[PDB]
Design a protein around this ligand. Sequence first.
Ligand SMILES: CCCCc1ccc[n+](CC(P(=O)(O)O)P(=O)(O)O)c1
Ligand SMILES: CCCCc1ccc[n+](CC(P(=O)(O)O)P(=O)(O)O)c1
Ligand SMILES: CC(C)CCOP(=O)(O)OP(=O)(O)O
Ligand SMILES: CC(C)CCOP(=O)(O)OP(=O)(O)O
Ligand SMILES: [Ca+2]
Ligand SMILES: [Ca+2]
Ligand SMILES: [Ca+2]
Ligand SMILES: [Ca+2]
Ligand SMILES: [Ca+2]
Ligand SMILES: [Ca+2]
Lengths: 362, 362
Amino acid sequence: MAHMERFQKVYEEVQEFLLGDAEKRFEMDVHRKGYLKSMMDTTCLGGKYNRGLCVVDVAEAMAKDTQMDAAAMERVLHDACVCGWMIEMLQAHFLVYDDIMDHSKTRRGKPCWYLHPGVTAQVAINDGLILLAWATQMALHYFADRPFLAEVLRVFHDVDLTTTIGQLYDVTSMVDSAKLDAKVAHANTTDYVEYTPFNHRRIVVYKTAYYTYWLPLVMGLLVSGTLEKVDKKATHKVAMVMGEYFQVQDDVMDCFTPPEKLGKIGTDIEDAKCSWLAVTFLTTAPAEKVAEFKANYGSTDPAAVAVIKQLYTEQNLLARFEEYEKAVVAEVEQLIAALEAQNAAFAASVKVLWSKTYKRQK
Amino acid sequence: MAHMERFQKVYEEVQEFLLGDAEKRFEMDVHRKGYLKSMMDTTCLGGKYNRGLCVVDVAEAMAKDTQMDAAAMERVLHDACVCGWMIEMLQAHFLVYDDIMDHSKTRRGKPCWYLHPGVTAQVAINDGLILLAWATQMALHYFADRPFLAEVLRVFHDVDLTTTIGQLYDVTSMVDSAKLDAKVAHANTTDYVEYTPFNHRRIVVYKTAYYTYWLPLVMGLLVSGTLEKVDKKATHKVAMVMGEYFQVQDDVMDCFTPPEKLGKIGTDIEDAKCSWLAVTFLTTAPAEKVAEFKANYGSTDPAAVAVIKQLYTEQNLLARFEEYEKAVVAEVEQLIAALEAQNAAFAASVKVLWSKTYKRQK
Ligand SMILES: CCCCc1ccc[n+](CC(P(=O)(O)O)P(=O)(O)O)c1
Ligand SMILES: CCCCc1ccc[n+](CC(P(=O)(O)O)P(=O)(O)O)c1
Ligand SMILES: CC(C)CCOP(=O)(O)OP(=O)(O)O
Ligand SMILES: CC(C)CCOP(=O)(O)OP(=O)(O)O
Ligand SMILES: [Ca+2]
Ligand SMILES: [Ca+2]
Ligand SMILES: [Ca+2]
Ligand SMILES: [Ca+2]
Ligand SMILES: [Ca+2]
Ligand SMILES: [Ca+2]
């Protein structure tokens, strides 16, 4: 929408900055400079830019609600774009690692970075660290004289921590939690006791909600200097609700949306993930169907996978998702009404975010 | 080792903080807390603690020099221990990843983290991110009301960046740099045209000197509030010299120090990495020797690795290292004497660091 063109211009600026700083500081040669350019473009581009563009929608909503001159509005928007790129590059970094962890094939319609034959998991592992480091470099450089530098770093780093703990819950969700010893191999579960609504919510809140919903909102507020003009606790709550839903959508599109339209080949089923479908199925389905699920789940065999999808379809998981979505919409709507009573400007930028989220198809 | 007891007590302190904060903020369960505890202990302990201890030695030298009273000195030492642990965790993070990247077997006399049977490289990859995040968490918590907080973050993230570019030079150094395409597999070199003193210096200065020499000295100065009492240029210079040399010793020991004494099993020869021995040997040995080294280096075959070590031995590599160490001793001493003319206290703390480095055996 409104800010794409400006946001993409800032990408070019920030890339030239970053590559030039490496030349100046690290004696970066021409070939590695180009490798780094292709790496940044491959990992950071091609997504929907929902997190980055939110920073800009929020910042501008709040800046217009303030009285400021042309140069100050221009500054807010530019800083917002830089902040948005910190988050997109945080995403880039998380996706490089997660694609390795999940041993996946495609991301955003192209092979996963680690799967580029001129890269491999060995180089990709270090490329991911460069991405994370650059996001902090952006703040240190662009916001060196800004009052919100310290607060930006604190929220960005807190969120980076939060997401790694989220990923921890995710990556250990298929193993009995009583059996984690860094000294003993552990088999995947066969009984699925821990596939509970509580465990699924815990995963999604921490691995997705904080960095996808909370971070863009807060950063938008930080760069426009209006973080003390909104109810902190309601902002966190609406971000948790939308974020949980956003990840329920993800765990509901990797089992029913063609890879081709999504841009990625989910393997929740093969990998026995504690997805919203698995928890919803395990807690509502009849007993023979639960057993048949346990004999088929967690299996690479395409015939086992097809059995799970058939069981999910018989269980009416799409319709259960529709009902959950109605409940979410009801709650979001009212959290937004209450934010609107306090700060109508901020509440509008929450609608813009929610609009890009509700009933999305990829 | 005046500060070891205090340093270790701070580790217990910081660990209990970190685990407790995840309980409070991420609904961390008792099993993953236990997992996290063992991960921390396994990846962060068992090293020599040169980096961490140097922060405290520098901080104390400067606090004595500025005549701090007992209250102030106790704060400075405690802050210095936290900074020290930020660096030891940075190291922890770097080695978790590097062990994966290098496919190594032992770190500090135990199996590499990713090789723990209950871990695997899948989990280790996210674990390494938790270590990095925790490093920032320490500063955000303990230095929340400290004016040096921003400069601590700044130098920390800069050095982390520098090291990852350092690591990029390392992992791409055995492939032809003109053939650095992400779309095209890269065969390892057969002619070694890029195995030069310039390329070797660039690798080790960036992957090693910054975080191992410069980062500890600076943090010791920042926490004691004395960074504005020493020559920044001379400080950086002496860090670069000691740090390159520190990497040279690490390269010499890969080939000549028994894995047992060392705590690790280097595969420089098998991976044919741009070490200080290979580079020197190539630009010191003849053509017949160079040709025999080209048809032996980069092979996992035990006989071929024995040929390499035998070439090195016959080319008197140990002896060329002694001579190199003489020139470095002459130059470090001159640079310390120069520092000592300006602030005797900081120069003495650079000597403490030098003396734990010069002629170390592991
Ligand atoms: C290292 C943090 C990885 C964080 C993270 C958080 C949320 C989603 N992902 C990737 C998704 P996907 O690969 O985009 O479908 P997941 O594997 O379903 O969770 C990664
Ligand atoms: C991943 C970031 C850089 C990691 C890094 C930096 C310096 C030395 N090391 C490890 C050593 P070692 O594995 O301790 O011998 P190297 O593999 O010889 O370089 C790792
Ligand atoms: C958060 C998680 C579901 C990963 C996918 O995030 P996304 O769908 O926003 O991906 P893009 O960055 O490619 O838009
Ligand atoms: C820089 C590189 C040689 C890394 C190993 O560093 P180190 O020998 O200081 O390791 P410890 O932290 O185990 O003492
Ligand atoms: Ca994934
Ligand atoms: Ca995943
Ligand atoms: Ca998914
Ligand atoms: Ca190594
Ligand atoms: Ca290495
Ligand atoms: Ca080594």
